[PDB]
């Protein structure tokens with residue numbers, strides 16, 4: 001029985017996709033751990049596929065099983081619009097995800113796009129796509145057709161301006177297939193192809209900038225630097241005395257800033273570091289992974305105060321602090337163990353940002369591949385049987401377009417499963433919501 005095999009094919013999508021896509025909206029909101037720019041697009045994808053599992057797929061089912069459109073004529077226009085609207089916001093949202101990642105990976109940053117521009121791009125996407133899919137809403141027609149003398153039956157189909165003029169309906173079905181399926185899958189493919197080699201054959205680059213008056217922080221910096229070199233980093237030591245602040249951090253995966261503490265009844269930085277601190281906003285620090293060390297003397301009121309001062313400025317500038325600062329007491333040669341320890345801890349933290357990157361990059365690639373393969377049938381169809389215009393095999397054809405349409409609807413419910421399976425901070429977040437309910 002074909003009607004029942006499509007009964008549960010369409011609703012398990014509805015159910016797998018409402019619960020699935022409701023968890024993604026929820027956890028990105030309830031957990032500040034999860035509020036990132038990438039997850040806001042991921043929740044935007046989720047909100048696009050929720051609009052399809054609850055609005056479209058429910059009324060689609062009943063128009064397929066019964067065969068008669070039993071809802072209003074307003075919905076006959078709106079459900080095809082709400083369906084086209086979703087695939088465009090999805091395609092725009094995935095294309096933004098791929099480019100943003102590519103940009104963070106060349107600038108060696110943890111954010112390029114701000115959390116407040118990301119809301120503005122999410123707006124344009126719904127705005128630009130609500131305009132691009134309005135032909136889907138206007139060129140629908142509500143009227144009667146009787147297959148045989150069944151006394152009530154009404155269908156819902158597309159009607160393009162001419163009585164036999166097919167051209168408006170194909171260029172739309174060719175430009176949109178072009179500008180919104182092979183163009184954005186072209187861009188996405190290009191980005192992840194570059195990103196992938198990048199992530200595979202990169203060497204980490206470290207900048208060490210210290211300020212040192214009698215050589216203690218300088219000795220500490222040489223000691224850090226010998227462990228990061230032994231760890232496969234390409235290390236770059238610069239005395240603060242010899243640099244200028246503009247663009248100083250650009251290109252580096254890791255910046256360590258070392259400074260000794262000075263001053264009289266107040267904290268002062270080491271003297272060569274003052275100009276770098278006064279100009280720290282021109283260095284490229286937002287999104288940059290940093291850490292801080294310094295030499296001090298626990299006799300003083302604020303032991304290694306300069307570290308705190310720098311850590312707070314870097315934090316104000318929106319930099320991503322990666323360890324708590326290292327504060328050496330006395331002669332750093334007598335503290336070599338504490339220093340080499342610290343350096344090993346910084347290295348491990350960088351390995352986790354790098355690993356978190358690879359893991360999330362490969363989940364994002366699975367999402368697009370499961371998107372493009374699932375839309376491949378329907379669009380193959382759409383391209384073929386919109387240059388042909390001869391398909392009266394509708395005992396097969398209508399089934400061909402539905403079973404093709406069911407595949408594409410799997411791109412809705414699939415996304416929460418990939419997150420839970422292939423991303424451990426999602427896995428834990430879903431199970432941390434099903435544990436407070």
Ligand SMILES: CCN(CC)C(=O)[C@H](c1ccccc1)N1CCN(c2ccc(NC(=O)c3ccccc3-c3cccnc3)cc2F)CC1
Nearest residue numbers: 060063080083084087172173176177180181382401402405
């Ligand atoms: C499934 C039930 N059935 C019959 C089996 C439907 O027809 C169901 C429907 C349900 C209830 C009432 C009326 C219609 N219809 C199912 C198809 N759909 C629809 C319409 C448009 C899009 N955008 C694209 O594909 C698309 C995506 C990216 C790039 C280009 C295109 C593109 C668009 C237009 C022409 N070229 C290419 C997707 C859609 F899914 C609207 C409702």
Ligand SMILES: Cc1cc2nc3c(=O)[nH]c(=O)nc-3n(C[C@H](O)[C@H](O)[C@H](O)COP(=O)(O)O)c2cc1C
Nearest residue numbers: 212213214215216217260261262296297300303304
């Ligand atoms: C005048 C003066 C003020 C100092 N103030 C502090 C301080 O406030 N907090 C602190 O932890 N160490 C303080 N120190 C100790 C120095 O930070 C320490 O001697 C350090 O080793 C100098 O580092 P450097 O040789 O790399 O420049 C002060 C030292 C001097 C001479």
